Design an enzyme around this catalytic site. Structure first.
Site, short mmCIF file in Angstrom:
data_model
loop_
_atom_site.label_atom_id
_atom_site.label_comp_id
_atom_site.label_asym_id
_atom_site.label_seq_id
_atom_site.Cartn_x
_atom_site.Cartn_y
_atom_site.Cartn_z
N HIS A 60 63.76 -14.08 78.52
CA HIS A 60 62.86 -13.21 79.27
C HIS A 60 63.61 -12.68 80.48
O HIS A 60 64.00 -13.46 81.37
CB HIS A 60 61.60 -14.03 79.62
CG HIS A 60 60.58 -13.24 80.38
ND1 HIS A 60 59.91 -12.18 79.83
CD2 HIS A 60 60.08 -13.40 81.64
CE1 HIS A 60 59.06 -11.73 80.78
NE2 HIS A 60 59.12 -12.44 81.90
N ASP A 62 63.38 -10.31 83.58
CA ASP A 62 62.57 -9.55 84.51
C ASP A 62 63.36 -8.45 85.16
O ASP A 62 64.36 -8.76 85.82
CB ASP A 62 62.03 -10.51 85.57
CG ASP A 62 61.07 -11.52 84.99
OD1 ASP A 62 60.08 -11.10 84.37
OD2 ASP A 62 61.32 -12.72 85.18
N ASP A 174 54.49 -12.42 79.31
CA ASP A 174 54.34 -12.69 80.74
C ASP A 174 53.33 -11.87 81.53
O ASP A 174 53.03 -12.35 82.64
CB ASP A 174 55.70 -12.65 81.46
CG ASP A 174 55.79 -13.54 82.71
OD1 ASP A 174 56.59 -13.19 83.63
OD2 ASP A 174 55.13 -14.58 82.73
N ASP A 311 63.21 -17.79 80.88
CA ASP A 311 63.70 -16.75 81.76
C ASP A 311 65.22 -16.77 81.79
O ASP A 311 65.86 -17.79 82.07
CB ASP A 311 63.15 -16.98 83.17
CG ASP A 311 61.68 -16.77 83.31
OD1 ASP A 311 60.97 -16.61 82.29
OD2 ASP A 311 61.22 -16.74 84.51
N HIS A 441 55.84 -6.17 85.30
CA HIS A 441 54.86 -7.17 85.79
C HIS A 441 55.29 -7.93 87.02
O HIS A 441 54.56 -8.81 87.47
CB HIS A 441 54.46 -8.10 84.62
CG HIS A 441 55.61 -8.86 84.07
ND1 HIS A 441 56.39 -8.38 83.01
CD2 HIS A 441 56.14 -10.06 84.42
CE1 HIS A 441 57.35 -9.30 82.77
NE2 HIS A 441 57.24 -10.34 83.61
O1 LIG Z 1 56.32 -13.29 88.10
C1 LIG Z 1 56.94 -13.89 87.20
N1 LIG Z 1 56.61 -15.00 86.60
C2 LIG Z 1 57.50 -15.45 85.51
C3 LIG Z 1 57.81 -16.94 85.76
N2 LIG Z 1 58.61 -17.57 84.68
C4 LIG Z 1 58.65 -19.09 84.83
C5 LIG Z 1 59.70 -19.68 83.83
O2 LIG Z 1 59.10 -19.50 82.55
C6 LIG Z 1 59.15 -19.51 86.23
C7 LIG Z 1 58.20 -20.25 87.11
C8 LIG Z 1 58.68 -20.65 88.34
C9 LIG Z 1 59.98 -20.35 88.75
C10 LIG Z 1 60.87 -19.65 87.92
C11 LIG Z 1 60.45 -19.25 86.67
C12 LIG Z 1 58.71 -14.51 85.72
O3 LIG Z 1 59.21 -14.05 84.45
C13 LIG Z 1 58.25 -13.38 86.61
O4 LIG Z 1 57.91 -12.19 85.82
ZN LIG Z 2 58.30 -12.12 83.71
#
Ligand SMILES: O=C1N[C@H](CN[C@@H](CO)c2ccccc2)[C@@H](O)[C@H]1O
Ligand SMILES: [Zn+2]
Ligand SMILES: *[C@@H]1O[C@H](CO)[C@@H](O)[C@H](O)[C@H]1NC(C)=O
Length: 1015
Positions: A60, A62, A174, A311, A441
């Site tokens: 994933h 971002d 996501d 991620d 997002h």
């Molecule tokens: O706002 C967002 N939330 C998602 C969080 N992904 C999770 C891992 O799966 C995450 C949670 C906490 C810290 C880092 C990563 C991110 O991909 C971003 O788009």
């Molecule tokens: Zn994301």
């Protein structure tokens, strides 16, 4: 055409009905914390009926969040893609899916030709598969459907050109809740399947219990089902590896082979992964297959999807190896042990869906039908993600401005073919890509770090400048005699004048038209109307004299009004907020009348004294302790008084009454009708001092809102023949009600300043007997019925307000239309409320690692429409949709797609013409040309122009309202040689049209057409 009002669809799952019945209890389900202990019959799978398992590797990525797009590209994504190319090349059975085309295009263009060829080969052979193929994975709450389509088109057009593929499966793991606008657009863009993840934990549990996590998702008004799109909802709390193998994350984490230590990662459940060996592979496979078989119990076929990713995964070569080699060992063991009755392999998303539908066709499963949406999301307990409906509202408003400037630039420039030296395609591509990027997002959602927000804003400012360049070059060409036209493609022939962005009090960005006997007697201005119907709208310009009159370019006088230029000041000496007037610049206001998709030219001329056809507004400043307010040459002296109630009426329009604190209290629609109570109020929400804190994502108020303490605010009343207004300087908000003869416009200049841990809400209080029902829109496309649920906390009853909301009873409706997406609700019968800004000191534990402390002044805009609806033909009480009236829809269009205004930059425009588009058809009011885009560069022998046509559905309320002309977009340009219906992305021809005539579309439908031209 299907009737979208009077036939309630029969669906297996209707999300509003589901919500009404569900209890939402948050009980401890065991290792599946939000579920139950899943049981399966070992004998379900056997030699004749195996479980087919597709493990789908993913990463994933971002496009901005904690780092900017370019920072992540350099530090992470370019390495992920380089190593994916190498490892997939060298390991033919390995697979990988890719979603975010912004990153892929960035990478691919920097590749040498040998590697580009290797990349094309792993795509063509099925190892690397694009999923969705949009520029981004967009937000689904705040995004306008037009921009969701824009970004999808940007990515898929790239993929077709460079990779020769068009995805038909969507992957949306996501976005923070999910909208039916997505299947609507995707199904009209060739898609066959989609996947979603972030839905309320209680919804996952309920659907899982009924095996309704795979469904045919149709629109809420669709009786027949032709909009349906097969949808897979993932069942667990996350898309990460611990929450994708099965219900027990303590087990699944042991199969994330990046967590053994050397990579800096571990398992919070305290059991690490261990490398698969011949001595442990049987016990490890026992544990893993048991997780798979439990997950399989939640679905109807013998084909199981196992995502494998997180991620920014699959970066280092060692990570590729540790995941691949350990899974290969597991597959070799499992697939050779008949007692498991499993065949497991790496796969892609399309492979999963193909196998599901083969099982369906074989009679193995039938899938339920579903309509509704998946807001508001909660991932756990009372943590509802309604904060991001409002976070970073400056950029939410900027999104809507740029939306319109992209449309206008693409439309204005489409009428001609342009030489490459004009740089038209270049500027449009940049504008489309920056706006597309912001649909991410973490972009429009307001959930990125401060410096990332700044990057998005800078990109969008460049995009706005690109649009302005293209628009003004196009106006110059469209309105200059052809044998005189002599363009310099670097020159500014016109400047844009935008009265509402960034807005009065936000940036002093507007140019004054400077006229004078010893400098310049007159100035041409031009208005553009992107809508496909004739339109009148008041327009205003700043001028250096009050003695200005307006003419059209047959030299016919145009009635005008001049008003002062008022600026509100937070006076640090007197500790009051009060307006100052300019003594050298003035506003002139007049009604512009503009052809469909057309242009109209006017002239502003100075005189030595008041001109015949120009009137002057009166001005009244209501405050104790006034001081003088000189206005230079403005001919009417400002008047003063103590605060008092006031009433105003412009034209034959409603009469509005205001409190002594400058806030609406009642609306009287006609001269004999009731003064209907309609009261504006500003309130504040706080943050909890114990427990979970609100942040960029989460809204966790410390109880219902408390009124803002207004003191004795200063009120400014301006009364004119064409435009009147009431403005008041409240703490944190300069609130303005503007009257032009129909529904008022509301503008709030919101500056939450240093008010920490505060959310400012604007509420409307009425006596409308709406009970627990209200309506909000989804992506500017459709209005959905909401029911306030007292069994859920306040923040759960907040919904996105991307463009409008309303309440109604049998007789009366109040609709609030917005120029920006914000969060809102109806928390009591007769109320509407919408959040203006939020300033939050704390992080909310979702990874952002900061509060929201970067607020800046924003000008929010609205229209407020009170109407009688007792004569309207409405849906029945069981229908899940609602629909606007004509007046509310036009008010929305007035906010989102206003007239564009251009000021000629030089002293004389040689060869100027008065109008463009007078012969364009003026289409029925419910039809829009959402997109007009020339698809070919000038070297193409056969030019192609694409159009997206959208028809909304307006209520029948007894207005005979007809005579309009048919709009055939295929004949808008001359020399048509072919007309085709296409997918909405323009990438596939669906129908060759007889007569080269593009039919109009049905209510609530959207169609795309491409016209081809021989000349
Ligand atoms: O706002 C967002 N939330 C998602 C969080 N992904 C999770 C891992 O799966 C995450 C949670 C906490 C810290 C880092 C990563 C991110 O991909 C971003 O788009
Ligand atoms: Zn994301
Ligand atoms: C594009 O893909 C199709 C197969 O889906 C094929 O018919 C055509 O040759 C391809 N063009 C190439 C290989 O670039």
């Amino acid at each position: 055409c299907q009737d979208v009002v009077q036939d309630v669809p029969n669906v297996d799952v209707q999300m509003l009905e589901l919500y009404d019945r569900m209890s939402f209890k948050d009980i401890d389900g065991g290792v599946w914390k939000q579920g139950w202990n899943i049981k399966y019959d070992p004998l379900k799978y056997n030699a004749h009926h195996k479980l087919k398992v597709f493990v789908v590797p993913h990463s994933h990525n971002d496009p901005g969040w904690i780092q900017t797009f370019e920072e992540y590209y350099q530090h992470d994504t370019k390495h992920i893609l380089s190593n994916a190319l190498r490892h997939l090349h060298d390991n033919p059975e390995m697979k990988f899916i890719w979603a975010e085309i912004s990153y892929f295009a960035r990478f691919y263009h920097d590749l040498g030709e040998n590697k580009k060829l290797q990349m094309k080969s792993i795509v063509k052979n099925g190892q690397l598969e694009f999923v969705t193929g949009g520029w981004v994975m967009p937000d689904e709450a705040n995004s306008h459907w037009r921009n969701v389509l824009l970004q999808l088109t940007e990515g898929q057009t790239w993929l077709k050109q460079f990779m020769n593929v068009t995805p038909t499966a969507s992957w949306a793991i996501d976005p923070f809740g999910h909208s039916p606008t997505m299947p609507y657009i995707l199904q009209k863009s060739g898609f066959k399947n989609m996947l979603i993840q972030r839905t309320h934990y209680s919804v996952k549990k309920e659907l899982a219990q009924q095996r309704q996590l795979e469904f045919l998702w149709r629109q809420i008004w669709d009786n027949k089902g032709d909009t349906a799109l097969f949808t897979h909802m993932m069942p667990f709390y996350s898309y990460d590896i611990p929450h994708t193998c099965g219900p027990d994350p303590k087990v699944c984490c042991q199969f994330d082979f990046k967590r053994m230590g050397s990579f800096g990662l571990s398992c919070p459940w305290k059991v690490p992964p261990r490398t698969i060996s011949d001595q442990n592979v049987a016990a490890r496979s026992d544990l893993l297959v048991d997780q798979w078989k439990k997950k399989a119990e939640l679905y109807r076929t013998n084909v199981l999807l196992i995502p494998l990713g997180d991620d920014f995964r699959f970066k280092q070569n060692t990570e590729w190896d540790v995941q691949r080699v350990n899974y290969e060992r597991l597959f070799e063991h499992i697939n050779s042990q008949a007692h498991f009755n499993v065949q497991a392999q790496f796969g892609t998303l399309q492979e999963y869906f193909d196998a599901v539908h083969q099982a369906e066709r074989a009679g193995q499963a039938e899938f339920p039908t579903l309509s509704g949406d998946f807001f508001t999301y909660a991932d756990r307990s009372d943590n509802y993600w309604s904060g991001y409906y409002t976070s970073r509202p400056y950029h939410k408003r900027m999104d809507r401005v740029l939306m319109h400037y992209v449309r206008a630039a693409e439309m204005l420039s489409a009428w001609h073919s342009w030489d490459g030296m004009a740089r038209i395609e270049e500027r449009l591509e940049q504008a489309r890509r920056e706006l597309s990027l912001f649909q991410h997002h973490d972009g429009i959602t307001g959930t990125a770090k401060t410096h990332v927000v700044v990057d998005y804003e800078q990109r969008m400012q460049e995009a706005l400048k690109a649009c302005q360049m293209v628009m003004q070059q196009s106006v110059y060409r469209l309105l200059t005699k052809p044998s005189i036209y002599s363009p310099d493609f670097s020159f500014s022939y016109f400047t844009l004048d935008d009265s509402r962005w960034p807005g009065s009090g936000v940036e002093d960005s507007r140019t004054t038209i400077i006229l004078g006997e010893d400098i310049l007697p007159s100035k041409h201005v031009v208005m553009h109307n992107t809508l496909p119907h004739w339109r009148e709208q008041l327009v205003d310009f700043y001028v250096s004299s009050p003695f200005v009159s307006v003419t059209d370019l047959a030299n016919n006088p145009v009635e005008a009004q001049v008003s002062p230029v008022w600026s509100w000041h937070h006076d640090t000496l007197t500790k009051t907020i009060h307006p100052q007037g300019s003594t050298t610049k003035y506003r002139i206001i007049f009604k512009a009348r503009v052809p469909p998709m057309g242009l109209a030219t006017y002239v502003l001329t100075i005189s030595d004294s008041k001109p015949e056809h120009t009137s002057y507004a009166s001005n009244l400043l209501l405050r104790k302790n006034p001081t003088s307010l000189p206005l230079g040459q403005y001919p009417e002296d400002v008047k003063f008084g103590d605060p008092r109630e006031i009433s105003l009426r412009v034209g034959n329009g409603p009469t509005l009454a205001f409190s002594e604190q400058g806030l609406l209290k009642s609306i009287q629609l006609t001269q004999d009708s009731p003064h209907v109570p309609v009261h504006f109020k500003f309130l504040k929400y706080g943050v909890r001092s114990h427990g979970d804190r609100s942040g960029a994502y989460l809204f966790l108020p410390n109880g219902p809102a408390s009124p803002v303490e207004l003191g004795q605010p200063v009120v400014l009343v301006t009364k004119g023949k064409l435009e009147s207004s009431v403005s008041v300087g409240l703490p944190s908000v300069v609130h303005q009600t503007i009257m032009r003869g129909g529904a008022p416009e509301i503008r709030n200049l919101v500056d939450i300043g240093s008010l920490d841990n505060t959310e400012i809400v604007m509420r409307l209080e009425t006596h409308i007997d709406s009970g627990d029902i209200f309506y909000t829109d989804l992506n500017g496309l459709q209005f959905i019925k909401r029911r306030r649920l007292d069994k859920l906390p306040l923040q759960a009853n907040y919904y996105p307000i991307p463009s409008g909301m309303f309440i109604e009873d049998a007789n009366t409706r109040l609709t609030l239309l917005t120029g920006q997406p914000l969060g809102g609700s109806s928390l009591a019968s007769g109320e509407l409320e919408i959040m203006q800004d939020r300033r939050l000191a704390s992080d909310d534990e979702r990874g952002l690692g900061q509060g929201v402390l970067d607020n800046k002044p924003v000008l929010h805009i609205y229209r407020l429409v009170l109407e009688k609806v007792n004569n309207c033909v409405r849906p029945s009480k069981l229908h899940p949709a609602g629909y606007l009236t004509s007046a509310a829809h036009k008010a929305s269009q007035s906010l989102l797609d206003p007239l564009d205004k251009f000021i000629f930059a030089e002293n004389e425009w040689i060869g100027a013409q008065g109008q463009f588009g007078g012969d364009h058809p003026s289409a029925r009011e419910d039809l829009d040309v959402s997109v007009m885009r020339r698809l070919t560069k000038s070297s193409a022998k056969t030019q192609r122009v694409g159009y997206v046509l959208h028809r909304t559905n307006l209520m029948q309320c007894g207005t005979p309202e007809e005579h309009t002309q048919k709009l055939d977009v295929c004949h808008l340009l001359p020399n048509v040689a072919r007309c085709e219906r296409t997918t909405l992305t323009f990438l596939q021809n669906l129908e060759h049209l007889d007569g080269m005539v593009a039919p109009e579309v049905c209510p609530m439908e959207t169609a795309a057409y491409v016209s081809s031209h021989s000349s």
